[PDB]
Swiss-Prot record, chain A:
Extent of the WD repeats: 14-53, 69-100
General function of this protein: Component of the NOP7 complex, which is required for maturation of the 25S and 5.8S ribosomal RNAs and formation of the 60S ribosome.
Assigned protein family: Belongs to the WD repeat BOP1/ERB1 family.
Note: Present with 2680 molecules/cell in log phase SD medium.
Full protein: residues contained: 708 to 807 of 807
Compartments where found: Nucleus, Nucleolus; Nucleus, Nucleoplasm
Effect listed in the UniProt record for changing residue 83 to R: Disrupts the interaction with YTM1 and cannot sustain growth
Subunit structure, as described in the record: Component of the NOP7 complex, composed of ERB1, NOP7 and YTM1. The complex is held together by ERB1, which interacts with NOP7 via its N-terminal domain and with YTM1 via a high-affinity interaction between the seven-bladed beta-propeller domains of the 2 proteins. The NOP7 complex associates with the 66S pre-ribosome. Also interacts with NOG1.
Name used for this protein in its record: Ribosome biogenesis protein ERB1
Gene: ERB1
Swiss-Prot record, chain B:
Subcellular localization, as worded in the UniProt entry: Cytoplasm
Keywords, ordered alphabetically: Cytoplasm, Ribonucleoprotein, Ribosomal protein
Name of the protein described by the UniProt record: Large ribosomal subunit protein eL38
UniProt keyword Mitochondrion, yes or no: no
The organism of origin for this protein: Saccharomyces cerevisiae (strain ATCC 204508 / S288c) (Baker's yeast)
Swiss-Prot record, chain C:
CDD domains recorded: KOW_RPL27
Something else known: Present with 7380 molecules/cell in log phase SD medium.
Protein name per UniProt: Large ribosomal subunit protein eL27A
Similarity field: Belongs to the eukaryotic ribosomal protein eL27 family.
InterPro entries to which the protein is assigned, alphabetical: Ribosomal_eL27 (IPR001141), Ribosomal_eL27_CS (IPR018262), Ribosomal_eL27_KOW (IPR041991), Ribosomal_eL27_sf (IPR038655), Translation_prot_SH3-like_sf (IPR008991)
One Pfam family of this chain: Ribosomal_L27e
Stored PROSITE patterns: RIBOSOMAL_L27E (PS01107)
Subunit: Component of the large ribosomal subunit (LSU). Mature yeast ribosomes consist of a small (40S) and a large (60S) subunit. The 40S small subunit contains 1 molecule of ribosomal RNA (18S rRNA) and 33 different proteins (encoded by 57 genes). The large 60S subunit contains 3 rRNA molecules (25S, 5.8S and 5S rRNA) and 46 different proteins (encoded by 81 genes).
Length: 100, 63, 130
RNA sequence: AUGGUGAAAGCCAGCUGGUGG
RNA sequence: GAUGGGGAAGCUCCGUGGCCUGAUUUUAUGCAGGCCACCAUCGAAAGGGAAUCCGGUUAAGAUUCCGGAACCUGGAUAUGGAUUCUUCACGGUAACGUAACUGAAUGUGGAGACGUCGGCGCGAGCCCUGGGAGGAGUUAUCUUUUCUUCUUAACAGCUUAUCACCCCGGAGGUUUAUCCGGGAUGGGGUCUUAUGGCUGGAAGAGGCCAGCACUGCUGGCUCCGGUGGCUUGUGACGGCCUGAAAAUCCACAGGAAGGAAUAGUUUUCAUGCCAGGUCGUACUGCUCCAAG
């Protein structure tokens, strides 16, 4: 939080391996997190900024499918500009697209 | 006394016993700048956004 | 060629790791695009396996390994050698410089050394320099 | 008498010319 | 200088234990073992030593009083994290680095803590002044003239490294002053922050002016530069025979000790709280600052 303090406001540790890609959705408030364990998660955030209040964050659901190869899982991901669709890549020479 | 540049950090101190607001003038074109200090912490429509949002449990005197 | 082939024992000299014995997995005399010079790949133990009630024994036998590339200038040649192919599959040039495979290689090395100090073999490697 | 008190080395250029002091 | 002792009948003289472990210690509730090496004290208000700076106050006081803002020693501690899903973490080959990330005996290292002198880089004070903003003065002779004000603290984060050190290299670089090399010239980097710039402190302080009150207030300015001799602190080199002691802090080799299921261990991490005694302290004054 660039307005609260230098240190992170909150930290997550549910990931079982190194986190490789984290990006913000261009339109929606959701942000995705992926790691080498082949697990992808998406969190909703209360981006409200009309008042001096911290944003509330909630998990949505777990995602998987990027089998770990050579200990490497999800390599990179990117959010769709306008809809809650996520593109993911992995070490298995395969990429997966997730939709509602 | 520290170079705090965070607004919510200052608000936490205010919400944590009287503040003060300082007004200064400078040119780069001429421009106005203001400071907010509490008991030392001194933060650098920012003035309105800060003052109007101040909790009623605090007293602030200009200059 | 040089005698610093796979399985050759070595000791770190710089990076504050001096005194920690390491085992050479594979040498690179010509180096690579990164580190274009003679440098070897080595693995070692950060903590040595130093009327017991069978509980302190497990703690003593616990080993914390480390893996890192080291230049020839920071290696002490050793007159001893031991088996290294037991974990060459996970410890390789590709594994270095790319997570999280470093953690898996460290875990494999830890398991191998825990299953090596027990039923003593290659004792000189597990000896800490005072 | 008794018992106390005080005080020019070096180095640069071609033996000759130079720098440091 | 007492003290373990020794002369002198004699006042008097000479001589320079406190720590750890154990089921409570088998003929029965009476104590066993292991560590190390010595001699108190006094003697420095110019030595070492943890810590405060700006403005104002008097009939005498202040770095003590006040207004403002920090620093150092010690302790219960309270919260969050870290230690990682579980038992004392990592990154780069490297100089090295992280907010934290247990360390007993035993040995060692750094600071403390160490002569004298020559030169040079750097911060910065002084001498000088350019442009500009206000006050004062000469002025029959010439003078866009002479004086005068333009100030920025302890402390904390950035930023800042001569020196020193690390990777490629394989036959000249360099100081004021001759110093370095078969590992140099060069290319690529790390670090000890001396004092340099920023901000907060801090313009609300102080100072330079104008106005009116008839016992104060209201308006502005307090700016932007430069290099040409004196000075100080430090850094880095170079000439000659070893220039103190102790107190106190930190680290290193060390791996005994302790670490899990209605809070595993700790708080060299961050925030917060409390206390910090006695004396000297006014004045005068062998030793301190010195413009052109």
């Amino acid at each position: 939080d660039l307005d609260l303090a230098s240190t992170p406001y909150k930290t997550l540790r549910y990931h079982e391996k190194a986190v490789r890609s984290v990006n913000f959705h261009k339109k929606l408030p959701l942000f995705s997190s992926a790691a080498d364990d082949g697990t992808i998660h998406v969190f909703h955030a209360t981006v409200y900024d009309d008042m001096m209040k911290n944003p509330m964050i909630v998990p949505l659901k777990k995602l998987t499918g990027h089998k770990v190869i050579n200990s490497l899982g999800v390599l990179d991901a990117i959010w769709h500009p306008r809809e809650a669709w996520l593109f993911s890549a992995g070490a298995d020479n395969t990429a997966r697209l997730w939709t509602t | 006394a520290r170079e705090i540049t965070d607004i919510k950090q200052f608000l936490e101190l205010t919400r944590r016993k009287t503040a003060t607001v300082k007004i200064n003038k400078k040119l780069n074109k001429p421009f106005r700048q203001t400071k907010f200090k509490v008991r030392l912490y001194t933060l650098v429509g920012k003035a309105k956004k800060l003052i109007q949002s101040l909790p009623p449990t605090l007293k602030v005197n200009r200059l | 060629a040089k005698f610093l082939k796979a399985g050759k024992v070595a000791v770190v000299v710089r990076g504050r790791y001096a005194g920690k014995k390491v085992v050479i997995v594979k040498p690179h005399d010509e180096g690579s695009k990164s580190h274009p010079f003679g440098h070897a790949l080595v693995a070692g133990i950060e903590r040595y396996p130093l009327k017991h009630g069978a509980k302190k024994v497990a703690k003593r036998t616990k080993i914390k390994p480390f893996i890192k590339v080291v230049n020839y200038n920071h290696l002490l040649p050793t007159r001893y050698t031991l088996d290294v192919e037991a974990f060459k599959s996970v410890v390789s040039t590709e594994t270095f410089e790319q997570p999280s495979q470093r953690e898996e290689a460290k875990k494999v090395v830890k398991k191998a050394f825990e299953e090596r100090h027990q039923a003593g073999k290659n004792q000189w490697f597990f000896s800490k320099l005072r």
